[PDB]
Design a protein around this ligand. Structure first.
Ligand code: HEA
Ligand code: HEA
Ligand SMILES: CCCCCCCCCCCCCCCCCC(=O)OC[C@H](COP(=O)([O-])OCC[N+](C)(C)C)OC(=O)CCCCCCCCCCCCCCCCC
Ligand SMILES: CCCCCCCCCCCCCCCCCC(=O)OC[C@H](COP(=O)(O)OCCN)OC(=O)CCCCCCCCCCCCCCCCC
Ligand SMILES: CCCCCCCCCCCCCCCCCC(=O)OC[C@H](COP(=O)(O)OCCN)OC(=O)CCCCCCCCCCCCCCCCC
Ligand SMILES: CCCCCCCCCCCCCCCCCC(=O)OC[C@H](COP(=O)(O)OCCN)OC(=O)CCCCCCCCCCCCCCCCC
Ligand SMILES: CCCCCCCCCCCCCCCCCC(=O)OC[C@H](COP(=O)(O)OCCN)OC(=O)CCCCCCCCCCCCCCCCC
Ligand SMILES: CCCCCCCCCCCCCCCCCC(=O)OC[C@H](COP(=O)(O)OCCN)OC(=O)CCCCCCCCCCCCCCCCC
Ligand SMILES: CCCCCCCCCCCCCCCCCC(=O)OC[C@H](COP(=O)(O)OCCN)OC(=O)CCCCCCCCCCCCCCCCC
Ligand SMILES: CCCCCCCCCCCCCCCCCC(=O)OC[C@H](COP(=O)(O)OCCN)OC(=O)CCCCCCCCCCCCCCCCC
Ligand SMILES: CCCCCCCCCCCCCCCCCC(=O)OC[C@H](COP(=O)(O)OCCN)OC(=O)CCCCCCCCCCCCCCCCC
Ligand SMILES: N[C@@H](CCCC[NH3+])C(=O)O
Ligand SMILES: [Cu+2]
Ligand SMILES: [Mg+2]
Ligand SMILES: [Zn+2]
Lengths: 64, 239, 265, 524, 59, 76, 94, 47
């Protein structure tokens, strides 16, 4: 019987931190602010623009 | 033999296969019109005699016995009765006891057919090969049909056996003449065998039944059944 | 709290990862077509969509881990439901690889006239089914034994040797994918060869892709077990990993037997 | 911003059901526009509105088939009615695995965009509904349209797999207390069985079309004749998907019809165990026959005999189901509202379609009738009549519930009669032409067949009138200034209901359950 | 309880030892290819040229 | 109650379908063509007289649809 | 081990020996002659389903929206259903 | 927000609801019968 390489109280501190905020699940933490409002957002914007341009070019038969 | 305006049911038969097909469909339709009329009658009498103004009390029965087994069993014997003839037709149509007398390859090219009665040549290169093109709109005489008339039709001796080897060269196709009751698929790799035996003279029309590329339905098939002497004269003249 | 909610099931909170993942899938598919046929935006669009799917999947699993480990929303019943769902997913994958095996068999029982009516086609130098493929089977067998060792590490209360067993299994899976890569490079026949080469390479490639994803699943479970996220009573991630790896090993066993033994005979 | 969160983000199985319904309506209208274009082209012999370009006609038939067989019935039976009325009816809180629910629904619209862009690229996909290999090969198309369509099928298939896993785990795990498996209603049961079929069969289609894709682009030889690999392999795989595919479009219809008959006959479903076992057996025997769609390709005699027998045996249980429904109307106190109208029409027209199917199931008869409009009549009655009429019946029966308002009755009956007359006029001459012998999927016909195709073309416009009436009904429902009552409808006013979903509220609040139901479960 | 862990530990160690031996066996093989087969019709087909056309992937 | 309304609406629907058909396939408000085989109005005539005796490539003219039309030659 | 929130409450109950929702299975003898056939509810009014049955007979299922002030008898098998709140009796949605 | 509402929709509240729903259904029909026609129009606009 051995705890796995962590004190396991860092996890308890993290549990306190997560249960001690008043937001949705995906916005908890300071990491998730940056992550889940900037990376997917800009990434989806670029994806949408490239998808539109690609459909346009394929339909019109231009830019082979 | 040819399609008719405002027609009900099958065309005319020129093959024992087509006689079998007509008989099997008529037996099936007899059984199934019995089924359909009985079901409609029971549904109608159930809806009408209990129409909220005669029986306003639900009468509350939910478990049924000795009637569920009855409508489980009786459709079974119905199916047995309507599967007795189908199996007999299959296992009396498969057998070819007699040797075929000729051999007519029907290679299904892309938007036009081809044929080779190759069994008349002393060499290796094949004689008596031609192409079966649809006649365009303006190339018709005053009588023929539209998009169903062919240049240089298939010629076949009547009252003698056949063996047509359907196959393709570009894409999927199907050799399909309904009056003879012949439909099979030409797959670019295989060589399907159809044994048929016409019973009377005259011309029979049919079309492609598979999606070829763009001129689908403009890829028709015409088979003439003519007397053996005339068939011999025609082949000797074509060689 | 449950006493006010009055039921132990799970009620999740909104997250845009469904829609984001769907947009990533559309990106991947249009990029795939635009790279399959030569076009200007093809490669970049395909790569962008693929990394979009990877990113949304990452944040999705991160969200599930966050909920279930720190918030503690998983109760016994949803714990069971996760096992149900993953068994169903494995059944779906079984049917997929069944379809591929049917393709192979329908192409190899009665070989057509156009490959000589014989199998394997003349001029395709079949791999000896005993030099590399046997070693791959032995490697996956040892990997399965190591996964079982990891499971009995977690169960027996010995939560330290679990990481040792998991890292041993990851090493064996990496050795397997390396030897599969060596086999692909040293192949005496390519994909564009006859139906034999074609079905061989398609089936083996999808099996290797499943090996990659199972290996990365095992890596995730190893990191979690090192960090302490798993306990003797409550662990589903590891059970999913073990079942998936056993699936991959069984598929490899069928693949080895049929293709490598029979096809070479 | 709160509304976009609540729609694009929320899990909320009810809201996903609403989104599924809206998508189903849009896809249905698109499919009907394609059908009307097809009918306009086929109205008279010669080039009618296409003015040539039979390739565009083949593209139209393909797009119509995909749109209505994948984006109209499935997003309405499974996503539409399934998502809503599985957890409400079974007595459970929000569905299991809500995020899978959301991802499946939001996967669907990109699949729609792929399908339309496939119909729009360089020339088009003129390969029919069932993409066959050699025509969809790179020698004969060389466009990319088939690639886009194949990816559309991939996205739709993945979404349906996710939904099926959702429903299976929910039924097996997320039931209420005391509710044994044999107390879940038949809608739940049909959704379970159809979800099993969708989970088992659909991956085979994904494998087959992946193989077709790598045959086209990455230059394999799976379906190239030179090198083995006959197209028969693809026929086998696609139809091993195809028949389980068609016993999925109708099973939720069966469930909804059972519920409607039960609630209109004042009595529950006669022979409950018979219904359950018959439906399970239909599900099982939907797999053991898959080549009854390719009798005329060159299989040996014994396979044809076996598939004949298998189709007859799959015919029996549907007979048990229909006779059970007829029995559970012998009680009394019927009341002819529009849901009952549509259920009755379903039973009648599905009977006609099924009998035609039996005629088609034999071998020799299929030799004579393969790929002729006899088959088109068969599956248009079966699929269109059955699925769409069950859909309309469910829609009325439960727009009593979703929005909280209620449709006007005279317009409901007018719509039923218009649609019934139109769509039953426009598909019986298909039987007659198929007997005459015209091949399927042709833009022009010989002059002989021009007699009926003028009459059938007269049937599409009536159905268009019916659909426009239906949308007038939907708008007048969503703006009806008179809420749910007892004079209007007697269903939701029940203080005692056979099905759990009628005694809750006008719409469910947000969690559908302040507290879960119970079961007395006597014999202490 | 722990006997099972010990037993699977032992057999996994046996497995990796045998596998490492077999890897040593398989390696150090030269692998000389035989001559290319005659160009049968069904070999090296190009229905549609690859995006990286001239030679297949992994070559 | 409403049978008046239902029947009236059904007849109106038939009227509207007829009007749309007449505009879209008899006068073609959307461009199109008509075959030369139907506008000649004498083509069916010869088609029937040819079912009496259909021309052939090798052999004398021969009949078609002998059963369903009851048309055929006698002792000779 | 490690747990907090819903799983913690579940495991605390399963360690203390109490069942969390044991009020959700009435499991009572059929009928009401001098003893009502009783249920339990955490709210004012609650859904209850009767399958009926001494042990041999049964009717399929009937859902009735049982309320506090008025006992309700099963429509088909005719047994009473008297409710007894074990929580704060309030309208289920407040 | 209306998670704690007596009705999930509460459709009555919005501003007269009539023009909004009428436009909604009409635009649904327009998107249903515009794209299928537009695909054919574009294909004839092509070669
Ligand atoms: C979902 C299945 C479905 C439906 C509903 C329909 C509907 C119709 N179909 Fe379709 N059809 C197919 C599936 C379907 N079809 C398939 C699979 C093929 C094969 C293609 C091929 O062989 O390659 C085909 C082919 C096909 C052809 C042959 C094409 C060819 O031979 O070239 C024709 C010919 O006219 C045709 C006509 C019609 C007509 C007139 C309707 C009319 O019934 C129009 C429908 C009318 C309705 C009443 C339904 C609309 C309902 C709504 C929009 C309301 C929705 C409500 C909500 C969701 C709330 N169909
Ligand atoms: C929509 C779902 C659906 C349903 C329910 C059915 C029902 C049946 N179908 Fe159908 N079928 C399709 C979907 C469906 N089909 C499609 C999409 C096609 C076209 C595919 C293509 O484009 O190629 C097709 C075409 C098709 C074909 C021909 C394919 C080809 O050659 O072109 C065949 C033949 O084997 C067939 C068989 C059957 C059989 C035996 C039934 C039976 O299950 C019917 C059972 C119903 C009953 C028979 C009615 C109720 C029974 C009674 C009231 C009891 C009394 C009856 C007896 C005495 C048993 N179907
Ligand atoms: C996740 C769920 C939502 C995803 C939304 C993704 C949208 C991506 C952008 C699509 C796009 O740009 O399409 C362009 C394409 C452009 O088509 P196009 O190439 O024919 O454009 C015509 C251009 N002119 C005018 C010059 C001729 O749009 C469409 O195909 C329209 C589809 C409408 C679908 C409605 C439902
Ligand atoms: C979800 C909300 C999506 C909102 C944005 C949708 C439109 C995306 C867009 O702007 O696509 C660009 C495309 C024009 O292509 P572009 O790259 O601008 O042209 C290059 C020429 N040198 O734009 C177009 O081609 C516009 C086509 C008109 C229809 C737009 C919506 C189509 C998809 C509906 C779903
Ligand atoms: C059932 C599902 C729908 C099936 C439609 C099939 C239609 C069909 O087969 O029609 C063709 C049939 C025969 O056509 P016919 O011109 O007579 O000859 C063709 C070659 N034998 O022609 C007909 O079917 C036309 C009608 C012929 C008479 C049939 C009578 C059956 C009903 C009897 C009811 C008796 C009273 C009941 C009360
Ligand atoms: C052989 C081909 C098919 C032949 C079908 C023949 C059908 C004949 C029907 C004749 C009906 C005559 C009715 C004369 C007036 C009777 C008094 C009356 O009020 O009738 C109306 C009644 C519908 O009223 P109901 O639905 O009960 O009321 C609920 C609304 N408050 O009306 C009814 O109940 C009519 C029910 C008709 C049921 C037909 C079911 C399909 C039959 C196939
Ligand atoms: C699984 C697919 C993963 C795709 C990852 C992104 C690939 C983008 C393209 C990268 C590329 O062009 O790589 C070049 C490589 C061939 O490199 P090569 O020049 O042969 O090597 C030099 C050795 N003398 O060629 C390749 O890497 C070929 C990659 C082909 C990918 C095709 C994907 C089609 C759509 C799949 C949807 C899923
Ligand atoms: C689900 C959709 C999947 C779409 C897959 C598209 C096809 C991808 C592979 C295309 C064929 C290819 O490039 O094969 C290369 C290679 C075979 O080797 P070969 O080229 O013959 O090398 C000669 C000697 N080694 O390697 C292969 O053949 C590998 C085959 C497996 C490829 C796995 C791709 C996984 C994509 C996952 C997408 C998830 C979303
Ligand atoms: C092909 C795609 C295959 C995808 C397979 C997805 C399986 C998902 C399994 C799942 O949901 O597991 C739930 C688990 C939650 O963790 P849990 O075990 O509840 O932790 C208890 C802590 N006290 O979840 C986890 O522990 C997270 C597991 C993440 C696995 C990621 C695998 C990525 C594969 C990428 C392939 C490209
Ligand atoms: C088949 C392929 C699709 C992936 C299948 C994954 C099966 C996973 C099984 C499962 O149960 O996963 C659960 C997990 C979501 O769990 P959740 O519903 O959030 O539960 C809350 C309880 N705490 O499930 C997930 O998180 C699933 C996330 C899947 C993301 C997939 C993104 C790409 C979609 C496919 C594109 C294909 C394009 C081909 C070209
Ligand atoms: C009800 C909704 C009706 C919508 C009608 C839209 C008509 C749009 C239009 O003008 O389409 C152009 C074209 C018509 O053909 P056009 O080239 O104008 O030929 C006239 C030369 N004599 O259109 C075409 O060639 C194809 C489209 C024809 C009209 C289809 C209407 C479908 C209605 C479904 C409901
Ligand atoms: N832009 C093309 C260039 C080569 C094809 C045209 N010559 C690539 O991609
Ligand atoms: Cu089928
Ligand atoms: Mg066919
Ligand atoms: Zn009771």
């Amino acid at each position: 019987s051995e705890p796995p390489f962590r004190p396991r109280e860092k996890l308890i501190e993290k549990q306190k931190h997560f249960q001690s905020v008043h937001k949705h699940t995906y916005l908890k933490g300071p990491y998730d602010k940056i992550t889940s409002v900037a990376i997917p957002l800009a990434l989806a914007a670029s994806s949408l623009y490239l998808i539109g341009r690609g459909i346009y070019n394929m339909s019109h038969g231009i830019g082979k | 033999d040819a399609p008719e305006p405002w027609q009900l049911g099958f065309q005319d038969a020129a093959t024992p296969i087509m006689q079998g097909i007509m008989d099997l469909h008529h037996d099936i339709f007899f059984f199934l019109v019995q089924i359909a009329v009985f079901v409609l009658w029971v549904l109608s009498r159930a809806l009408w005699c209990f129409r909220s103004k005669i029986s306003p009390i639900p009468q509350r029965i939910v478990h049924g016995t000795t009637i569920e087994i009855l409508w489980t069993i009786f459709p079974s014997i119905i199916l047995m009765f309507i599967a007795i003839p189908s199996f007999t037709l299959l296992y009396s149509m498969d057998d070819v006891v007699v040797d075929p007398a000729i051999t007519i390859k029907a290679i299904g090219h892309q938007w036009y057919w081809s044929y080779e009665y190759s069994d008349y040549n002393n060499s290796d290169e094949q004689s008596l090969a031609f192409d079966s093109y649809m006649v365009p709109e303006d190339d018709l005489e005053l009588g023929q049909l539209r998009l169903l008339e062919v240049d240089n039709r298939v010629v076949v001796p009547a009252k003698t056996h056949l063996r047509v080897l359907i196959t393709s060269a570009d894409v999927l196709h199907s050799w399909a003449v309904p009056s003879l009751g012949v439909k099979c698929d030409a797959v670019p790799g295989r060589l399907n065998q159809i044994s048929t035996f016409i019973q009377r003279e005259g011309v029979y029309y049919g079309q492609c039944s598979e999606i070829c590329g763009t001129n689908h339905a403009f890829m028709p098939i015409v088979v003439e059944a003519v007397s053996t002497k005339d068939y011999g004269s025609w082949v000797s003249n074509q060689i | 709290m449950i006493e006010s909610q009055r039921h132990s099931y799970h009620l999740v909170d909104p997250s845009p990862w469904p829609i984001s993942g769907s947009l990533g899938a559309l990106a991947t598919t249009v990029g795939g077509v635009m790279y399959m046929h030569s076009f200007q935006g093809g490669a970049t669009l395909l790569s962008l969509g693929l990394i979009f799917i990877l990113y949304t999947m990452f944040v999705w699993w991160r969200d599930v881990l966050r909920e279930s480990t720190l918030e503690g929303h998983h109760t016994k019943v949803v714990q069971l439901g996760l096992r149900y769902g993953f068994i169903l997913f494995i059944v779906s994958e079984v049917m997929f690889l069944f379809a591929f095996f049917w393709a192979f068999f329908h192409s190899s029982l009665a070989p057509t006239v156009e490959i000589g009516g014989i199998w394997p086609p003349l001029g395709i130098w079949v791999l000896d089914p005993w030099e590399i493929p046997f070693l791959n089977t032995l490697i996956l067998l040892s990997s399965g034994a190591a996964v079982t060792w990891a499971h009995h590490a977690i169960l027996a209360g010995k939560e330290k040797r679990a990481v040792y067993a998991l890292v041993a299994t990851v090493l064996l899976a990496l050795v397997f994918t390396g030897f599969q890569g060596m086999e692909y490079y040293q192949a005496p026949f390519t994909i564009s060869d006859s139906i034999y080469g074609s079905t061989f390479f398609l089936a083996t490639g999808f099996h290797g892709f499943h090996v990659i994803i199972g290996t990365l699943f095992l890596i995730i479970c190893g990191i979690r077990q090192y960090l302490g996220h798993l306990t003797k009573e409550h662990h589903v991630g590891f059970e999913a990993a073990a079942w998936y790896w056993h699936f991959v090993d069984v598929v490899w066993l069928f693949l080895f037997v049929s293709i490598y033994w029979w096809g070479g005979i | 911003m709160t509304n976009p969160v609540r729609w694009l983000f929320s899990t909320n199985h009810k809201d996903i059901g609403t989104l599924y319904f809206i998508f189903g309506a849009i896809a249905g209208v698109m499919g009907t526009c394609f059908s009307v274009l097809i009918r306009m082209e086929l109205a008279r012999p010669g080039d009618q509105i296409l003015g040539g370009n039979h390739q565009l006609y083949n593209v139209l038939i393909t797009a119509h088939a995909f749109l209505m067989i994948f984006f109209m019935v499935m997003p309405a039976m499974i996503g539409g009615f399934g998502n809503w009325f599985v957890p409400i009816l079974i007595g459970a809180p929000d569905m299991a695995f809500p995020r899978l629910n959301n991802i499946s629904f939001w996967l669907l619209p990109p699949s729609l965009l792929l399908l339309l862009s496939s119909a729009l690229v360089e020339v088009g996909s003129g390969t029919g509904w069932t993409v066959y290999p050699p025509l969809s090969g790179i020698t004969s198309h060389s466009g990319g349209a088939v690639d886009l369509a194949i990816f559309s099928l991939h996205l739709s298939g993945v979404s349906s797999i996710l939904g099926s896993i959702n429903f299976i785990t929910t039924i097996f795990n997320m039931r209420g207390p005391g509710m044994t498996m044999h107390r879940s209603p038949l809608f739940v049961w049909s959704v379970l069985v159809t979800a099993f079929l969708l989970l088992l069969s659909l991956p085979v289609l994904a494998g087959a079309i992946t193989m077709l894709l790598t045959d086209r682009n990455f230059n394999t030889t799976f379906f190239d004749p030179a090198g083995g690999g006959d197209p028969i392999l693809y026929q086998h795989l696609f139809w091993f998907f195809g028949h389980p595919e068609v016993y999925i479009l109708i099973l939720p219809g069966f469930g909804i019809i059972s519920h409607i008959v039960s609630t209109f006959s004042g009595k529950p479903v006669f022979g409950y165990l018979g219904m359950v076992y018959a439906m399970i057996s239909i599900g099982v025997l939907g797999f053991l026959v898959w080549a009854h769609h390719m009798f005329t390709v060159g299989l040996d005699v014994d396979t044809r005999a076996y598939f004949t027998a298998a189709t007859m045996i799959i015919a029996v249980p549907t007979g048990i189901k229909i006779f059970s429904w007829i029995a559970t109307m012998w009680g009394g106190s019927i009341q002819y509202k529009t849901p009952m109208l549509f259920a009755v029409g379903f039973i009648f027209l599905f009977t006609i379609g099924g009998l035609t199917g039996i005629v088609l199931a034999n071998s020799g008869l299929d030799i004579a009738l393969h790929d002729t409009y006899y088959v088109v009549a068969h599956f248009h009655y079966v699929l269109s009549m059955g699925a769409v009429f069950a859909l309309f019946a469910g829609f009325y029966y439960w727009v009593g519930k979703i929005f909280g308002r209620t449709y006007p009755e005279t317009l409901g009956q007018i719509h039923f009669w218009i649609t019934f007359f139109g769509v039953n006029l426009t598909f019986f001459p298909m039987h007659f032409l198929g007997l005459s012998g015209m091949p399927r999927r042709i833009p022009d016909y010989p002059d002989a067949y021009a007699g009926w195709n003028a009459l059938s073309s007269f049937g599409s416009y009536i159905s268009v009138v019916g659909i426009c009436c239906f949308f007038v009904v939907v708008t007048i429902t969503s703006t009806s200034g008179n809420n749910i009552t007892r004079a209007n409808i007697p269903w939701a006013v029940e203080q005692n209901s056979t099905t759990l979903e009628w005694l809750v509220q006008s719409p469910p609040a947000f969690h559908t359950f302040g507290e879960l139901p119970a079961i007395k479960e006597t014999k202490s | 309880d722990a006997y099972e862990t010990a037993k699977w530990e032992k057999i996994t160690y046996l497995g990796i030892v045998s596998c490492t031996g077999l890897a040593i066996y398989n390696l150090s093989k030269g692998h000389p290819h035989t001559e290319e087969p005659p160009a049968y019709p069904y070999l090296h087909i190009r229905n549609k040229e690859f995006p990286w056309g001239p030679d297949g992937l992994f070559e | 109650m409403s049978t008046k309304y239902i029947v009236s609406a059904i007849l109106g629907s038939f009227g509207i379908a007829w009007v749309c058909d007449y505009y879209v396939s008899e006068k073609k408000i959307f461009g199109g063509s008509t075959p030369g085989t139907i506008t000649n109005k004498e083509w069916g005539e010869e088609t029937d007289k040819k079912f009496q005796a259909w021309p052939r490539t090798a052999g004398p003219p021969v009949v078609v649809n002998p059963i369903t039309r009851q048309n055929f030659v006698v002792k000779s | 081990p490690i747990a907090t929130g819903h799983e913690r409450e579940e495991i605390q109950a399963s360690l203390e020996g109490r069942d969390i929702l044991e009020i959700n299975h009435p499991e009572g003898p059929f009928g009401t002659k001098e003893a009502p056939a009783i249920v339990k509810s955490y709210f004012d009014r609650r859904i209850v389903g009767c399958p009926g049955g001494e042990g041999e007979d049964e009717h399929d299922v009937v859902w009735f929206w049982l309320e506090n002030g008025k006992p309700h008898e099963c429509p088909v098998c005719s047994q009473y259903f008297e409710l007894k709140v074990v929580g704060p009796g309030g309208d289920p949605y407040g | 927000y209306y998670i704690h509402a007596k009705h999930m929709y509460n459709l009555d509240r919005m501003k007269h609801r009539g023009l909004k729903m009428s436009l909604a259904v009409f635009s649904a029909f327009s998107i249903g019968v515009a794209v299928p026609v537009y695909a054919v129009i574009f294909q004839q606009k092509k070669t």
